[PDB]
Amino acid sequence: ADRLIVKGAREHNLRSVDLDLPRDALIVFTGLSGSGKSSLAFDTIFAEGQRRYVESLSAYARQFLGQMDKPDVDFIEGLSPAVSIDQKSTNRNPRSTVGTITEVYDYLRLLYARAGDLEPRSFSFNSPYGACPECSGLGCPVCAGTRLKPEILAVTLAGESKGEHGAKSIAEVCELSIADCADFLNALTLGPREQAIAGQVLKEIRSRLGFLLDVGLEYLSLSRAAATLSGGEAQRIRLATQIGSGLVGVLYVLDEPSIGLHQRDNRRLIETLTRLRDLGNTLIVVEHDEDTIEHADWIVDIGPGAGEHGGRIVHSGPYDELLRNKDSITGAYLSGRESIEIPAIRRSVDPRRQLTVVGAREHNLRGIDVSFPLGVLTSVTGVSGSGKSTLVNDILAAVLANRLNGARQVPGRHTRVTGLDYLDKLVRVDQSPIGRTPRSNPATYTGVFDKIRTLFAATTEAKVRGYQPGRFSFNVKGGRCEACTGDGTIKIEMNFLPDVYVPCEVCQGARYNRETLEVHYKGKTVSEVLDMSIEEAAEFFEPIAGVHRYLRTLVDVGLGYVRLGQPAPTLSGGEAQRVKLASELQKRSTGRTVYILDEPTTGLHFDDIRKLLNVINGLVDKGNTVIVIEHNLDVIKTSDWIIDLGPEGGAGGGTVVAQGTPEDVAAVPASYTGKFLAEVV
Amino acid sequence: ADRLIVKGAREHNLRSVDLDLPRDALIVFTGLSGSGKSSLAFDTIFAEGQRRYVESLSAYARQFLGQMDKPDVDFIEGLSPAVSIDQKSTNRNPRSTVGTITEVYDYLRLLYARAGEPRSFSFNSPYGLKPEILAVTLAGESKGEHGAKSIAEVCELSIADCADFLNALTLGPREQAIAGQVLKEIRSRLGFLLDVGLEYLSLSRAAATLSGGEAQRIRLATQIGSGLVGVLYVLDEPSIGLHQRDNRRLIETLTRLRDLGNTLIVVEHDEDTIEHADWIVDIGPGAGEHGGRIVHSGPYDELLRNKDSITGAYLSGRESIEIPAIRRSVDPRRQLTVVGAREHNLRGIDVSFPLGVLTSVTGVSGSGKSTLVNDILAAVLANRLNGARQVPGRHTRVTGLDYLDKLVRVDQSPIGRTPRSNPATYTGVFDKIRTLFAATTEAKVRGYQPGRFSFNVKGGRCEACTGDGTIKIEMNFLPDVYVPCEVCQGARYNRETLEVHYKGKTVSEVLDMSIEEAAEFFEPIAGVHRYLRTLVDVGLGYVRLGQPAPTLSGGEAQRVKLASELQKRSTGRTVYILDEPTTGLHFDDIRKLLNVINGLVDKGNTVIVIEHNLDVIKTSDWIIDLGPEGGAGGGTVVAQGTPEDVAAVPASYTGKFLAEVV
Ligand SMILES: [Zn+2]
Numbered sequence A: 001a002d003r004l005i006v007k008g009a010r011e012h013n014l015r016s017v018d019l020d021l022p023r024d025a026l027i028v029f030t031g032l033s034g035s036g037k038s039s040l041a042f043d044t045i046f047a048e049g050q051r052r053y054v055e056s057l058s059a060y061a062r063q064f065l066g067q068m069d070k071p072d073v074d075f076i077e078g079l080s081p082a083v084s085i086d087q088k089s090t091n092r093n094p095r096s097t098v099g100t101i102t103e104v105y106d107y108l109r110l111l112y113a114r115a116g117d118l119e120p121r122s123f124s125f126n127s128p129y130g131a132c133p134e135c136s137g138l139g140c141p142v143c144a145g146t147r148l149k150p151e152i153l154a155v156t157l158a159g160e161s162k163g164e165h166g167a168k169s170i171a172e173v174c175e176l177s178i179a180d181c182a183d184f185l186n187a188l189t190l191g192p193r194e195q196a197i198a199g200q201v202l203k204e205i206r207s208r209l210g211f212l213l214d215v216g217l218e219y220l221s222l223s224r225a226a227a228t229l230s231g232g233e234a235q236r237i238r239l240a241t242q243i244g245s246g247l248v249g250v251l252y253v254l255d256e257p258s259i260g261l262h263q264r265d266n267r268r269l270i271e272t273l274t275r276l277r278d279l280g281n282t283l284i285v286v287e288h289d290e291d292t293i294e295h296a297d298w299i300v301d302i303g304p305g306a307g308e309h310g311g312r313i314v315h316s317g318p319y320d321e322l323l324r325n326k327d328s329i330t331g332a333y334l335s336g337r338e339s340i341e342i343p344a345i346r347r348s349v350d351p352r353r354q355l356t357v358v359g360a361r362e363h364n365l366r367g368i369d370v371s372f373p374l375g376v377l378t379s380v381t382g383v384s385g386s387g388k389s390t391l392v393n394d395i396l397a398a399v400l401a402n403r404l405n406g407a408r409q410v411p412g413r414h415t416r417v418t419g420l421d422y423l424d425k426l427v428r429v430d431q432s433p434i435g436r437t438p439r440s441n442p443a444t445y446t447g448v449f450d451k452i453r454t455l456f457a458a459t460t461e462a463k464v465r466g467y468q469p470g471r472f473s474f475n476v477k478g479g480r481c482e483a484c485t486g487d488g489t490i491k492i493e494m495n496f497l498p499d500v501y502v503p504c505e506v507c508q509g510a511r512y513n514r515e516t517l518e519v520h521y522k523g524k525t526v527s528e529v530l531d532m533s534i535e536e537a538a539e540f541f542e543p544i545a546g547v548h549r550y551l552r553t554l555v556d557v558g559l560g561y562v563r564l565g566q567p568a569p570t571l572s573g574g575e576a577q578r579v580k581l582a583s584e585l586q587k588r589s590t591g592r593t594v595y596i597l598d599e600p601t602t603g604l605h606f607d608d609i610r611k612l613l614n615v616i617n618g619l620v621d622k623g624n625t626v627i628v629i630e631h632n633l634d635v636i637k638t639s640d641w642i643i644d645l646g647p648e649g650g651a652g653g654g655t656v657v658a659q660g661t662p663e664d665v666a667a668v669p670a671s672y673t674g675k676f677l678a679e680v681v
Numbered sequence B: 001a002d003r004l005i006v007k008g009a010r011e012h013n014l015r016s017v018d019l020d021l022p023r024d025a026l027i028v029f030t031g032l033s034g035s036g037k038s039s040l041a042f043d044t045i046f047a048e049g050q051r052r053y054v055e056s057l058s059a060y061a062r063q064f065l066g067q068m069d070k071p072d073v074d075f076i077e078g079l080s081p082a083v084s085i086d087q088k089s090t091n092r093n094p095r096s097t098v099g100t101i102t103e104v105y106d107y108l109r110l111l112y113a114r115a116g117e118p119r120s121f122s123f124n125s126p127y128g129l130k131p132e133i134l135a136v137t138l139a140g141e142s143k144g145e146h147g148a149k150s151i152a153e154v155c156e157l158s159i160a161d162c163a164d165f166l167n168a169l170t171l172g173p174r175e176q177a178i179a180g181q182v183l184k185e186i187r188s189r190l191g192f193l194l195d196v197g198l199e200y201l202s203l204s205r206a207a208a209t210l211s212g213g214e215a216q217r218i219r220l221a222t223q224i225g226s227g228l229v230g231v232l233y234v235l236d237e238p239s240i241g242l243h244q245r246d247n248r249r250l251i252e253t254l255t256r257l258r259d260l261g262n263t264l265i266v267v268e269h270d271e272d273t274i275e276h277a278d279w280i281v282d283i284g285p286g287a288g289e290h291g292g293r294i295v296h297s298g299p300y301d302e303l304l305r306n307k308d309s310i311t312g313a314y315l316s317g318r319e320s321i322e323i324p325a326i327r328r329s330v331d332p333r334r335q336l337t338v339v340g341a342r343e344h345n346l347r348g349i350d351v352s353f354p355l356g357v358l359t360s361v362t363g364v365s366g367s368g369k370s371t372l373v374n375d376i377l378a379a380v381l382a383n384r385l386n387g388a389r390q391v392p393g394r395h396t397r398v399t400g401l402d403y404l405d406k407l408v409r410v411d412q413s414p415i416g417r418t419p420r421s422n423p424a425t426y427t428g429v430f431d432k433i434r435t436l437f438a439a440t441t442e443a444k445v446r447g448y449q450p451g452r453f454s455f456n457v458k459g460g461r462c463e464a465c466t467g468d469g470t471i472k473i474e475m476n477f478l479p480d481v482y483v484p485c486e487v488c489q490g491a492r493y494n495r496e497t498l499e500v501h502y503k504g505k506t507v508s509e510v511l512d513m514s515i516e517e518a519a520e521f522f523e524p525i526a527g528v529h530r531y532l533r534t535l536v537d538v539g540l541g542y543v544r545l546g547q548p549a550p551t552l553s554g555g556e557a558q559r560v561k562l563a564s565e566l567q568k569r570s571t572g573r574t575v576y577i578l579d580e581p582t583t584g585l586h587f588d589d590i591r592k593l594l595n596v597i598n599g600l601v602d603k604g605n606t607v608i609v610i611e612h613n614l615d616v617i618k619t620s621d622w623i624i625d626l627g628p629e630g631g632a633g634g635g636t637v638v639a640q641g642t643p644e645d646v647a648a649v650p651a652s653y654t655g656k657f658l659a660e661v662v
């Protein structure tokens, strides 16, 4: 029976949903932000699917797996081992490059060991043999950037230098040059009788190289540090690795593969996915992308709204069935019932109020000078990896924070920045998590927790118990649980699989001892008002106007489903970005202040995008300058000023392909973004 | 394509063989013992599959997987998740019962919690068998006990109906709605346990109170209960320790597992398994250097038509093991009879053993035949004939015992737990070879003593491996493995000792070289010639002379002990005890070992052996059947006498199978 049949998912907001899906099909999960799509996708399905097989690895593995909490499920049928790919894995290992994680570099070491003598364990910078002494293999002037020892950089296939620019293939930036060199120039160097001994090696190499080419990663160097890799890039090289693995029948759960992906690469990505299912695998992807939804064999919609309203199932069937189903906001958006109108009136670009950066020579950027209107919604486009985030984050944000906020951070290579007197302060709405500990949470982060604790101290139960606001603070020893030390959870080292939390055993996750919870304000204790969400907190804290100011903004930004007592690590990057944005909304919007956005459309439904654009429109209407980097066509057609980068990524590109209003960008044919925009505008 | 493809398999015996097999089919490896069946199957396909799929685990996994040696294979594709069920893993876990391993125990705990807390029902929690939990009753039968009566005493069938079907009609609507799925899972798992023919045993029996085959059967029952699709399963002679009646039932279980969506590869000498095999692959003729090839690859009929396959000849009728037309006379006066064997399930029966004759022990598995034969008989015989002080099983006494000189217990246990022991060390030729090497011009001009050439003596052995030839590096998630020492490259010696050459041969050279070629090599040396002749006769020629003890199978170790005791004067009377020597032996191997045993008994000696192989039984002149079933139901003599005596008796299942031959 080639069908996956499940019953009784109840993870967070799931009312025991029962599902049945055909095997070896393109399954897409969709819903509003926080509708539980991630729940079904990962927690209910992949956890069980992986763990069932991981038990079979050994008897000892079952013992090490028994300590975690099995998902709240009724029954599952037709299960097979599954592999998940996500952006959560962003290693910042100093001795890690692209070649190390791909493990392709070690294979080139093997090839140079055999062909060409040469041997591995001496080319590897992770070991002192290949580690240059002045940098410990990290990459110091003595090593001349190339982390390997100079002798290793010198030895070759009887030539001049397989090093000082990578080993003739690593620091080689574009994978096109690497592939051409290794496949043709290096292959023919061997002697009369080496075909039968190295052709299989070359075939193993170039197949993997073609795999990296297919996923659209033909630009970045193999010697780039892993810290310089985004979450989307990590998801991409993971996808390439699993494509090259060659296993058949494994399930795969994906979380928006098109993150940070230019509009041009969508069809190529779809092509790379389709052949994987043609092998005999099955794909389940959470997406808001129209094309992938159209090409998907099956679509499973999820309960309307998020949180309590979400967690249901709206649709389960073909794309036409989803379009017929009117209960799906996604279906309405796709079939045309819902859309976002292009603003007929665009904010006028001010030639005088014009920020400009000159001579940005950092990395692949060719010292280009770009001007940005002030007080007008402006967007930055361009193909993936063209360094569009590079100049912005390294140079512009750093300089603006140095000169306006007084921050001490080193900017990238550039000459200088014009003006800047037209704005008051820098706003950097990053996508990094709010906090790295369960102690940090939206209540403490936004400071509302202080107001709640002070109000709690001003209650009858607290004043008769002599409980200070600190007694209601899980962060301090006062009132917190003696086992969870206020976290409410205990982190457990899990040896090979990614690390997981377990709930506290004394307070059962209350973050407090039972004595502190005896206080009640409006019938809610500290914990009771803690786990109760912001959307239902809006009506609960209406009398407290000061606290109401925060929750109003968190409601406006569309985060009703989120929990105040939800730990910061459990919050996604986009959710943390929204938390920072709404906290900034809990301020006095000056007439002039620059707002910086980094792909805010992450993990948002079309209605969520329409909600957030309404929020940001008011902010721009304050005369404030807003800048955002995006690949979504709707925000491109909505913004009044758009500047395209490229036309290539990495070393190729780094120049201004086009700029101007959406009409201006669509007029330019050299801009791929303009090519996709002309179809709409 | 749904076809496994293999190229360039060279590890150990393999001579760069290339394979191509269908997927989701039952394929059986066959050949002579040591032809390369176990090596080729496990070491290449299972190792490759498991290693490759563990590479798809996490970043921390790969760095710890790169340490072990990659297989000597070129080009294999069509790979799928790997699971092996073998008899190697004999866990000693004191707090592990049958139910816990098969995970049904958790289901019973949950069911009794919902119909009485499952954690309070287990012995691994401070809440919980303690007497207070025994007060909880689910009276599906007249008796309601959470394992106190169900798991403790009544075996698979009885616990099954009493706690799954009797209470299936005494369950209230709330208990039904709350635990029906759990009870149904219990029923399905118990049915699977019934199918594999493990019905005889109770489920509270200790984990350690099992054989390797019993542990293997628990393992494959767990694999049945896992419910995964698309995983190939490799089996290592599951028919061991299993009655021929259960053979077809086990075949049914494997066929249902394959129909579930899996593929199966089994190395077996069983005729029934070969006949039931969808595909059969034969391996190069002979063992050792002679093997390592491919003879047949196709249907069973193709193997029959293949005249180059010894297994093909045996199955086609060209080769067979013939019943001895003349049997040794049973002497009623020479008769050793135990009395009152109350140990385990044995119901105090008295069993008479004829002397100066070939006798085999039969009966369905688990009926305590091993219990009696080892615990009572072997311990008593070692106490009185060898003087060893070991406690025998519960019995009264044994008649006679004055008709034999000493006990010869040939156990299947491995020769040694460490590479410190090799065949040369065990058989004693290591002293002779060391003295011979010291008696050379190179050794005497180097001032080298016999101990210099020893790997257990510091002088001469490698300073890193101390003569082991390998270094152990711990494996975190997978079982620990050995990687050879790089200082000596596994030579177990420093290079300063390897310059000595007797007949132009160094210590490591003659160590690696097998006894098969050592037979002609040490022909002038008659003293070592007797030893090598005994190994050749027993059938260990293809084994490496210096092969480490851990790299030796149980049957090979038993054969090594048999040859070592064959390096002795076979008296007119001495008892030999055997424990299923058929393990890992082709029909021709069975025939030659039968010739060896016939020669041994022809010295007037008395030999006893436990077996399920019909050829061994039919050759045996005297047979005594145990039964009627295994476990507590059983432990009584169903029949005894000549092969015709047992075959005539229909109550004897072994007699039922023998009546077909006789
Ligand atoms: Zn250096």
Ligand SMILES: [Zn+2]
Residues within 6 Å of the ligand: A481, A482, A483, A484, A485, A486, A488, A489, A504, A505, A506, A507, A508, A509, A510, A511, A512
């Ligand atoms: Zn706690």
Ligand SMILES: [Zn+2]
Residues within 6 Å of the ligand: B462, B463, B464, B465, B466, B469, B470, B485, B486, B487, B488, B489, B490, B491, B492, B493
């Ligand atoms: Zn060594």
